[PDB]
Amino acid sequence: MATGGLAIIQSMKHKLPPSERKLADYILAHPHKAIESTVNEISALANSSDAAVIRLCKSLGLKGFQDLKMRVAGDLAKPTFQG
């Protein structure tokens, strides 16, 4: 409920359109940066668009980018994802 952000992104990595894919790739590669980024920052980092970040979040069943960041942060809190 406050976790699973990385699992949900990794699950869809190969089922996402291009613009959403660039985003999922950057977040998976740099999840610590991702949880401290704005929509404008993450879209620039993934060479994608602001609209694609919102679409990515909706594609995953999330309320938006804050939800995505919270759920990723929840995973980074776990020993399962620490290291």
Experimental method: X-ray
Q: Determine the Cα–Cα distance for residues 24 and 56; give it in Å rounded to an integer.
A: 8
Q: What is the CATH architecture of 2-83? A: Orthogonal Bundle (1.10)
State whether the Cα torsion 20-52-1-74 is positive or negative.
Answer: positive
Cα–Cα distance for residue pair 81/51, rounded to 1 Å: 29
What's the angle, vertex CA 37, arms to CA 32 and CA 39, rounded to 5? Answer: 135
d(CA 53, CA 9): 12
The DSSP secondary structure of 61-80, one letter per residue, reads T-SSHHHHHHHHHHHHHSGG
Question: Do the Cβ atoms of 62 and 68 come closer than 8 Å?
Answer: yes
Contact 56, 46 (CB under 8 A): no
